[model samples]
Target chain A: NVQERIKACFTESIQTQIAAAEALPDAISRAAMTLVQSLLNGNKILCCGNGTSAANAQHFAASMINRFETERPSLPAIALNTDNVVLTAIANDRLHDEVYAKQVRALGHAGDVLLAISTRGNSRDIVKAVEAAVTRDMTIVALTGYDGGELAGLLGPQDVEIRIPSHRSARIQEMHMLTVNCLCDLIDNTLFP
Target chain B: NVQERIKACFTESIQTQIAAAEALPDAISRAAMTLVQSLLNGNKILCCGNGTSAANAQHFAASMINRFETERPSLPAIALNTDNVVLTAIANDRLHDEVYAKQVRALGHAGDVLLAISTRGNSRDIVKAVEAAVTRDMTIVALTGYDGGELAGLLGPQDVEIRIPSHRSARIQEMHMLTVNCLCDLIDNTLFP
Candidate 1:
């Protein structure tokens, strides 16, 4: 019975991937080029998210800073949530929603990119971080689901949004992982090639 | 051109998922059940990995500690890599490979689970962590790729290995994400439904 449930997960994930394949390539490419341009301009990427989305943000940053599918020079990227001291200090001393926003204001700059991820696209912390990035003139690339929620409304003309078609958080996150992998590959190929 | 490159990533990821759908569901179900049993026994999970794998480890932990597909009570899970102070102290005072192993030895219990992830399964840190978990009498649920590397060899009859059927680290990681989602879904269904 549980094995059948597991099989059902595979089936749904495959269907989500199929839907994403049709809807996402162009936007993903645009996001990759945005990251490439920012990196070429000697600006780094600052990534943030909530919950498991935070893990995706950190994964993207790690892939950029290390290697993703190819050997190359390390890139500049920071996952805002990795530092427990900073996170806890900020969340304890200040408001919890300002954790990433404070980091963005402190570490971000013009031409830098902020890669923000949200399943519903309405996380207050991420929205505030996006505002902080905008204030610093950093570009925004949001990975969102379910009509892109509030995050969709915040992006300027310079930003890219890779919104998964599905509304389910698990399915959206599964597609987000794939989209992140594609971004890594595209960034590697663009930079190295 | 870059769009085509992005499309190829989607294609390859889909193919990897398709292959994994056939190879991984049984092992994934077993791992989920392992995790379920560990949780039901009042034991928490300790997760560890390197690079993007570290992100996956944290993602799994966050999903468990928060909620996955449905709203439920928080579960006990810890991502060993999240504490910057502990990680830096361990890496600086000891070997970098012992960062997670030290954490495991200190926090892991006999009935707990170690969700170790390695794209190639050869990462010295992950292998050492597995060794530490074994010494603690903990059960391991390893998400690995490409022959399961040294980590696979270290697993005993009690551990569950969900080895992705691929060599490419990115592809393997994509499948790993899907497998994790399956595990989370299964765990939730078994516990709540």
Candidate 2:
């Protein structure tokens, strides 16, 4: 049950995401503060991703908008990917890459938060959405993988990012779940604390 | 667009799901035979529900595993609520309701099929999970609402569950979408023409 090898891998992953966070001098830790502020100020969190990422988006949206802790009232959240017709139509009539981006353009505001989750950190849809957010002066929370490469550019102090460690999509996703769950706890702390 | 008239109602939900199917019946026709054969070969189908019509647990299961689309699959099904671990996990640990029933179980024998979906069925967990088909026993087909529920549910039942007409949950829900899309679709020529 206690294999040193697997344990070391876990340690390394934590260190990597930690380093990535430290590289920004505390981006991951600080992103939560803004999220807490958004909730208290009555803003909503919008999440989206593809495939497994979509499921993750829906899950996060549910917990945020419905009830992360049951007794607590729901916070507002919109899982944009929930609209298939809109997505497919946007992909067809418009451009595939801009589907999410376009929605962000029409819906995002100066302070709205956008979560562009992609395993590659390079999906055109996510990348475009991030690009669009830049113009909106919106806040972005990118959950990415494979060293987070270029996405790091957007996650710096001037911007918001959470680059999870591990090249493995599965592990990265698990960490994302951890991140959101903890954020819920953070919400609890920020709101009721 | 802001008027009550502009807001989509459940009645138009399936129409929305179909409009997004892209290739219509043709793209999914490839998997239709396979779906039919899954039952003919002797597999089970599983369905789950919430509230009063969790009655459908027996209704849809009775119909599909028993008879329908006589030419198509005999497909066995398991309404997930039928189990303990699944329901509790979904309701408690996952903190979501009605999702456990749809989760891919130990893959079914060769041609087993899954028709996991809901209309008032706005649960995100069920709709979101499809890619984790590292599933144990089943091939999945789902029905959703409001643009095919939370996840894409793969567009239709030939290979997927052909969601019935309309969008608004009231119009779509278990009764209409299921009866029209899930059940009636099995009524031979009705679906094709």
Candidate 3:
């Protein structure tokens, strides 16, 4: 019974994402261009997320600082959520919502990129980080879902937003992972190929 | 030029995964079965990986302990590589190969699951962890690629191995992320459905 249930869940979740993933190419293209410009200019990328989103932020950053799919030199990227000491220090000094925002203020610059994530698009921490990035005039690329939440509303003309058109959290998260993987692939093909 | 290259990269990575993803269902089902049985028995799922794979280990554990797609009771899971303090201490005191193996010995028990990951299937630390898991009588479900490396050969009759058939590290890592998402979806559906 669990096996059957598991299969059905996996099938439906992935199928829904395939349908939603069709409309994301343009947004991903825009995000990739922004990232290319930022990295080419020697500006770093600062990523932040919460829960599974936080895990994804770290995933993306690790792919950058390490190697995505090729044998090349390391890229510059930082996941704000990975350093627990900084997170704890920020949470202790200010608030949990300010954890990523504080890092954004310290590590981000005008030409840098802030890759923020939230499956539902309404993660308070991500919203705060977006606000910080906006103030610093960094490029904001949101990997979000479910109408893009508050993060979607905060986008400027130059910002890129890749929102999978799905309401289910499972489907949204799957699409986000797929999208980020594509971004990593694009980075690899451009920088190394 | 970069934009066109970026789009092609995205499309190619996705299509490559679509082709390779077809062979994964049965293996995923087996891994899901192992995970379900382990979680149902009140045993923990201890995950570890190297580089970006390590970040995925943390992502999977966070999805399990916090929430995957639904708001449910937290599951029993741990990312052995998340604790830098422990990892550094172990690497400094013992050997780098024993980083995950040491954790396995300390935190693992019989009937527990070790979700070991290596995109290339040849990380010394993961190999050592597999050895430690076998010593502790735990189930080893390895997420690997590129001919399954040595980890593939190390699996026994009771173990489950999900290998994405790819030689490129980026493509392999993407499939690994997709596979883990499916595992999380299956676990959520089984426990909450």
Best by lDDT: 1
Give the CAPRI rating of model 3. Answer: acceptable
Each candidate's DockQ score against the native complex?
0.81, 0.06, 0.43
**Residue-level lDDT tens digits of model 3 in B84-110:** 998899888868889999899998999
Which of the numbered candidates is closest to the native, going by highest TM-score? 1
Q: What residue pairs are clashing in model 3?
A: none
Write one digit per residue (lDDT tens) for candidate 3, span A65-125: 8766576889999988888898898788769899889889988899999999898788788
* Model 3: residues with Cα > 4 Å off, grouped in runs: A1-21, A191-193, B1-21
lDDT of 2 at B87: 36
The lDDT for every candidate, in the order shown, is: 0.89, 0.57, 0.82
Candidate ordering by lDDT (highest first): 1, 3, 2
Q: How does residue A57 of candidate 2 score in lDDT?
A: 75
DockQ of 2: 0.06
Chain A of candidate 1 gets a TM-score of 0.97
